[PDB]
Nucleic acid binder design. Structure first.
Ligand code: ANP
Ligand code: ANP
Ligand code: MG
Ligand code: MG
Lengths: 645, 650
DNA sequence: CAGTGCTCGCAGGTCGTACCTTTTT
DNA sequence: GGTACGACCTGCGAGCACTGCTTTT
C-alpha cells in the first residue's frame, strides 16, 4: 500500500488527493488529471486516513468511467469491489431496489425503457384535449423526461415560464404528464427519470432511510459534475447533508449535456452552496501535444462569459494537427480508411485510434470504408443489440413474466408468436382493462369465464404465461430465457421463416451467451433474473478486439486516444442546424463539444470535412464549420494524400 | 357321389338341382325353396357331374345374398372356397381390375361413391344451359345412374321418348351426362353403374377377354333374377353366350326394384331369349305357417296381369296374423318394444325376430323404444359407418394418395386439417386445372415455382409434400398402419383432439376404422391384399363390414329384407302414404302394384309370427300429421285379427 | 434509405335456410 | 327435426405511402 501522493501526482494534484474531510471542488481544464486525482484520493482515503471502502461512494455519468476507476484504484489499492462506484441512475436503482417498498414501489416495479414509454403516451393521448393527431408521442416524452430532469411535478409544469412547450399548450402537456404518472404508477412501473426523482422523494419523506444510506456514502466523489442536472444535484445535496464529505470534480468548458437539462451553474455555484468548501485548481495538460492543445485553447477562448483558467501544456508540441476537405463524404470515408492503414504501418495499434462524429448516421459510411480496407471496427452507441426486435421481445416476455401489469410488453409479445390473438379482441381486452381498472393478464384468464370476451385463445395464453411464471420463480436466467424463446414459439417462428431469420436466431443464442457471462460473473453471485433486466436496461454506450473505436462526440467525454479522427466538422453538423437557430448560447454549447473532441487526442488529431453530403436520399452542398475559422493558422489543411494546400 | 338330392329336396326341386347343361329357369313363389335349390345344384355339379369349383359362378344383388350362398355352400359342401360368389357389381370389379387396360382404364383407377358423384356434377352443371338451385345435383345423378342401368349412352339419352326427364330438357340432361363422362374419364375414375356397363363394353370390343373369363364362368347361377336391370341382363347374356350353361332363379311377385331400373320382363321372357331352356316350377312354401301364407296369397291375388302360380302351404296354420293401430307412432314403437319383451320370456331369442319398415327415418323412433326397455338393437342400412365424416375423410386421403387426379376427394380433405388452403386459392387452383387440364396435385408442388399461386405460396408446397409422404407410405406399408400414418400426419387426429370433447367419440370411430382395416387383412380371402383392394371392398358394401362397424333384434328396410326369413316379424308403418307411398299413389296402378309386391315380400319373411302395426298420427320432420291405414289391409280383411296395445281384438 | 404506419385481400369459424323422406350398388 | 350449405366478421400478411438525423442514464 502506502501510495505517496507526491510520487505519482504534482503538488496541487497531491494536496487535492490529500483532502480528507469537508466540501471540496476540483475545477480544472481538459486532460488536467482530474479523474486521476479522484482515483488517487480514493486510494489515499483508505491507505492513509484508513477510511473503509464500504464508506466510499464515487459516481459518474457513463459506466465506462465507472469501471475505469474501479480497477484503476485496485492495482494501487485492493477492494475495488468493496467500493460503491456507478452512475447516478445505477445508484438510483440499487437504493430503490433496497428501499422501494417504502414509497409505494412494490415487487415487480419495472424499468420502462425509452422506446417502451411511447406505448404509454400513445395510450393516454386519446383521452387528452391538447391535440395534434399529428403531435408525436416522442415530443410529449421530451417534455416529461426533461421535466423530471428539472425535478418538476405536473403541478410545477402548470406554472413553467413558457405558455407553450415544444409544440404544445402548457396545461395540455402538464395534463399528459399527469395522466402518464397515474397510468404507469398503477402498473407499478418507473421510468429513467424516476430512478433519480423517486430517490430524492425517498430521502425527503423517510429521513431514517437517508440516514442509513449515508453510512454507505460518508465520503462522496462526483466526476463530470458539470453535466449534472437539477435532480442529480438535489440527490447529491441530500447525500452530503449529514457529514458533508462531498468532493466534486468538473470543467465548465466541458459541459455538453444542456439539451437534457445539464446545469452549468451547479459546478460554478458549488461554493455558494458550500461556503466552507476547499478549491483546488489544476493548470497543466498532461494528455496532449502542445500542438492540439493550443488549438483547443484558441477555440474555447472564443466562448464568452466562461471562467478563464490557465491550461498550460506539459508535452512538447507534437505532430501538427491536420484537416482535409474531401469532395464527397465517401471520399471522407476513404480518407479515414486510407489514413488508418498508413498510421498502422508506421506502428500505431488499431485500438489507440478512434473516430468521433456529431451524429450516429455518420457511422454507416465510415464502417464500410473500414470494411473495404478490412480494418477491424468497434462501434459504440449504434443501433443497440438490446434494441433489436429479437432480443427486445424476449425480454418483454421476461418482464411480463415478473410483472403481470406490463401491457406495453404484452403488445409486442402477443403478436409475433402468432396466437391469432385478435386486433379487435385486443381492443376489448383494453376495454376490459378500461372498465375494470385491472391487471390486464388476469382478464385474459377470465375471458372464457366471467364476462366472456375466439374465446379460449386467451386462456391458452395465460397458461403459457403461468408456465413462464413458474419457470420464473426457480429456473436459471440463461435457461429460463431459452424456455421463453422455445415455449413462446418465437423460436418456431424464426425457424419457419428462417433464411434471413437465421441471423436473428443467432442473436437470440448470443443473448444466452451474454447471460452466461452475467451469471458466471463475479458481482452477480446469486443474481436474480430481475437483476439482469435491471442491468440490461441501464447500460451506457461492456454488455452493450484491438479495433478502431467509432463513436459520437458526446460519448467520448472522459476518454483519450493517441490518434483521433473527428469527421463531419461542418456547418449544419458541428454547430448544428438546431444550435444555429438557438443563437449564441447554442453555438457556445457546440463549441464545447468540438472542444471535448480536440482534447481527446494525445499525439495526432485528424479532422475532415466534405464538400457534398447525403442525408436520407438527397445530396446537398456542405460548408466548412464556423469553428475552423476560430482556429485558422493553428492547423495545416491537407490533400487526400497528406500535404498542405 | 355325396350330396343325395332326393333326401334334402322334393322331386321337382331335385330334378331342378340335377340340371347340368343348357339354359334353365326356376320360377316359383315366395319361400318355395328356390335359393335352397341353388346350393344343392352347385354341390351337385361338384360331387356328381364333377364340375370344378373354379368353373362355377353364382351371382346376386346383395352381399346379404353373397353371405347366404357362401354359408349355404361351405356349411353344406366340401371344397367351397374357390367358388366365385358375389353380386354383379362385385364381379364387375374383379373383372375390370384384371382386364381394365384393354378398355382404357389405367393402373389404379378410382372407384367413386354415390356421394362422390356430386363434386363432379356440381363442377359441370354451371356450364350447361339447365340452371341450378332450381335443379339440384341429386336429380342429375338420378338420370345418369338410371341411364346406365338401361345401358345407354349420352346419345341414346338424346333419343329417349320423354322430351323432359325428371325436371329437365332431354338434351340438357344428355349434355350434362356427356360432360360428366369426359370429366370422370380424365380423372381415371369410374362409378358403380360403370362396373357393369364398362364390363359389358369390355366383352363387346375385346372378344379374347370374354373367352378367358368364360372359362371361369362355364356354369352360371343367378338368384333374384327378377330384379336384374337391362345392363345386368346384357352382362349375363354375354357370359352365357359361349357355353349357355345359365340357370336363373326368381319370382315375379317379388320384383321390387323397378325404380332401380329393374326389368320385370327379364325373368318373364327368359325362354323367348333361350328357346331351349328347361322350366322348373315350385308349388310349395316351406317357410311359413299357413296363416301367414293365406294372407300373402290373397294380397298378391289383387295384382293384375301377373303370372298366376299356386303356392300351397306345407306347414299347419300357425299363430294368427295380428295388426295393431296405435294412437301415436311412439305408442307404435312402444307396442313393438313391449311385445318383443313378451315374445322373449316365452322363449323366443332376440335374433329370430326382426322389425321391417318402409323408409329409414322410421328407425329412430323404434330404436329408443328398444333402448328404453334395453332390448339389443342391430340396425341394418342406416346412416353408414363409412358415411360418417371421420371415416370418409381419411379414405379421401387414401384415394388421393393412390389417385392424384381425384379432385372430389381433394375438396373434402385439403381444408379439413386446416392448412390455410385458400377458398379463393382453390378457385385459382381449379382455374389452373381448368387452364392446364392437369391433375391437381402437381399444381400444388409447382406453387412456389411457375405461376406462383401466392399469398400462401409455401402452403401448397407443404401440402403436395404431405401427400408425397402419403404416397411413399402408400408405396410399402400395412393398410392398418398406413391409415394411422394418414390420421396422424395429416393432422386429422390433432383437430379432433384439440376440439375433442365431442370429437373423442369421433376419434373412437377412427380407431374402429383401423380396427376393421386390421380385421380385414387378417381375414382369409385377403392374403396379400393391397389397400387399393380394401377401398374397393369398402365402397361396394351392401346393407359383414357395414353391420359390424350378436343375438339382437334386426332393424332394416322392407327392400333389404329380400331373400331372408325370421320366425317373428314386425312390419311397421303400414299406412297410406308409406306403404303404398305418396309417390306410388301418384304413379297410378303400376306404382300401386310395385308397392303391393314390396308389402308381399315383408309378409313372406315371417315363419311363425307376423305382427303388423299402424299409427293414427305420425310426426315426420316437425309437424304431426293424420295417418291412415294402408289400402292393402283392406285387401287382406277377414284374413287377419286386429289387436289392442295388449294383444286382444278391438 | 429504412423503419413504421396503414390499408387491401384472403382463411377459418360461427351463424342463420332450405329441403328433406321412397326404396340400393 | 336435422343437416348441409351459403352469407358475415375477425385475423393476419405483404405492397403502398410517409416521415425523421441531434446530442443520453
Ligand atoms: N501527475 C501526473 N503525472 C503524469 N501524468 C499525469 C499526472 N496526472 C495526470 N496525468 C495524466 O493526464 C492524463 C489525463 O488525466 P485525466 O484524469 O483523464 O484528466 P481529466 O480532467 O479527468 N480528463 P477530462 O475529464 O477529459 O477533462 C492521463 O493520461 C493521466 O495519466
Ligand atoms: N326341400 C326342403 N326341405 C327342407 N327345407 C326346405 C326345403 N325347401 C325349402 N326349405 C326351407 O324353406 C326355406 C325357403 O326357401 P328359399 O329358397 O331359401 O327361399 P326362396 O324360395 O328364395 N324365397 P325368396 O328368397 O323370397 O325368393 C329354405 O331356406 C329352407 O329353409
Ligand atoms: Mg475526467
Ligand atoms: Mg331367394
Amino acid at each position: 500500500a502506502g501510495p505517496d501522493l507526491l510520487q505519482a501526482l504534482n503538488p496541487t494534484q497531491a494536496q487535492a488527493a490529500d483532502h480528507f474531510t469537508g466540501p471540496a471542488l476540483v475545477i480544472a481544464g481538459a486532460g488536467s488529471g482530474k479523474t486521476r486525482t479522484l482515483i488517487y484520493r480514493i486510494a489515499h482515503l483508505i491507505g492513509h486516513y484508513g477510511v473503509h471502502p464500504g464508506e466510499i461512494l464515487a459516481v459518474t455519468f457513463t459506466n465506462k468511467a465507472a469501471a475505469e476507476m474501479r480497477e484503476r484504484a485496485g492495482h494501487l489499492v485492493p477492494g475495488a469491489g468493496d467500493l460503491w462506484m456507478s452512475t447516478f441512475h445505477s445508484a438510483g436503482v440499487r437504493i430503490l431496489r433496497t428501499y422501494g417498498e417504502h414509497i409505494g414501489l412494490r415487487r415487480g416495479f419495472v424499468i420502462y425503457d425509452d422506446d417502451d414509454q411511447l406505448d404509454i403516451i400513445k395510450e393516454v393521448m386519446g383521452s387528452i384535449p391538447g391535440i395534434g393527431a399529428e403531435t408525436q408521442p416522442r415530443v410529449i416524452r421530451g417534455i416529461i423526461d426533461r421535466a423530471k430532469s428539472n425535478l418538476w411535478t405536473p403541478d410545477d409544469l402548470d406554472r413553467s415560464r413558457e405558455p407553450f412547450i415544444s409544440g404544445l399548450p402548457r396545461d395540455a402537456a402538464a395534463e399528459a404528464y399527469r395522466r402518464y404518472e397515474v397510468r404507469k404508477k398503477g402498473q407499478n412501473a418507473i421510468d429513467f427519470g424516476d430512478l433519480i426523482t423517486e430517490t430524492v422523494r425517498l430521502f425527503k419523506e423517510v429521513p431514517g432511510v437517508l440516514d442509513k444510506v449515508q453510512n454507505k456514502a460518508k465520503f462522496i466523489h462526483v466526476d463530470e459534475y458539470q453535466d449534472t442536472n437539477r435532480a442529480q444535484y438535489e440527490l447529491t445535496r441530500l447525500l452530503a447533508s449529514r457529514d458533508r464529505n462531498l468532493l466534486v470534480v468538473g470543467d465548465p468548458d466541458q459541459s455538453i449535456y444542456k439539451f437534457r437539462g445539464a446545469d452549468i451553474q451547479n459546478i460554478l455555484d458549488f461554493q455558494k452552496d458550500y461556503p466552507d468548501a476547499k478549491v483546488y485548481m489544476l493548470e497543466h495538460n498532461y494528455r496532449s501535444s502542445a500542438r492540439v492543445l493550443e488549438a483547443a485553447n484558441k477555440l474555447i477562448e472564443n466562448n464568452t462569459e466562461r471562467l478563464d483558467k490557465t491550461l498550460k501544456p506539459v508535452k512538447e508540441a507534437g505532430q501538427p494537427v491536420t484537416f482535409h476537405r474531401a469532395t464527397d463524404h465517401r471520399a471522407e470515408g476513404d480518407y479515414v480508411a486510407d489514413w488508418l492503414t498508413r498510421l498502422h504501418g508506421e506502428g500505431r495499434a488499431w485500438s489507440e485510434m478512434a473516430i468521433l462524429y456529431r451524429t450516429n448516421a455518420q457511422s454507416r459510411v465510415i464502417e464500410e470504408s473500414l470494411r473495404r480496407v478490412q480494418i477491424p471496427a468497434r462501434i459504440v452507441g449504434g443501433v443497440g443489440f438490446y434494441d433489436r426486435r429479437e432480443i427486445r421481445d424476449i425480454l418483454a416476455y421476461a418482464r411480463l413474466a415478473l410483472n403481470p401489469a406490463d401491457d406495453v410488453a404484452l403488445r409486442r409479445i402477443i403478436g409475433r408468436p402468432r396466437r391469432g390473438i385478435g386486433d379487435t379482441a385486443l381492443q376489448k381486452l383494453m376495454e376490459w382493462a378500461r372498465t375494470h381498472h385491472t391487471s390486464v393478464l388476469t382478464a385474459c384468464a377470465n375471458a372464457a369465464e366471467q364476462n366472456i370476451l375466439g374465446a379460449h385463445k386467451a386462456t391458452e395464453f395465460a397458461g403459457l404465461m403461468e408456465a413462464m411464471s413458474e419457470a420464473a420463480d426457480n429456473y436459471e436466467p440463461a435457461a429460463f430465457l431459452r424456455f421463453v424463446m422455445e415455449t413462446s414459439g418465437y423460436l418456431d417462428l424464426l425457424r419457419q421463416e428462417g433464411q434471413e431469420g437465421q441471423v436473428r436466431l443467432e442473436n437470440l443464442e448470443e443473448l444466452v451467451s451474454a447471460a452466461e457471462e452475467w451469471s458466471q460473473d463475479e458481482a452477480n453471485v446469486g443474481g436474480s433474473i430481475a437483476d439482469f433486466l435491471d442491468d440490461a436496461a441501464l447500460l451506457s454506450s461492456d454488455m452493450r478486439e484491438d479495433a478502431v473505436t467509432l463513436m459520437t462526440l458526446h460519448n467520448a467525454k472522459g476518454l483519450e486516444f493517441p490518434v483521433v479522427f473527428i469527421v463531419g466538422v461542418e456547418q449544419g453538423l458541428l454547430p448544428s442546424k438546431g444550435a444555429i437557430a438557438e443563437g449564441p448560447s447554442g453555438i457556445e454549447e457546440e463549441r464545447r463539444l468540438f472542444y471535448v473532441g480536440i482534447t481527446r487526442a494525445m499525439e495526432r488529431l485528424l479532422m475532415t470535412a466534405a464538400q457534398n453530403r447525403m442525408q436520407f436520399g438527397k445530396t446537398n452542398a456542405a460548408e466548412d464549420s464556423a469553428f475552423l475559422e476560430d482556429i485558422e493558422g493553428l492547423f495545416d489543411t491537407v490533400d487526400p494524400y497528406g500535404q498542405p494546400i
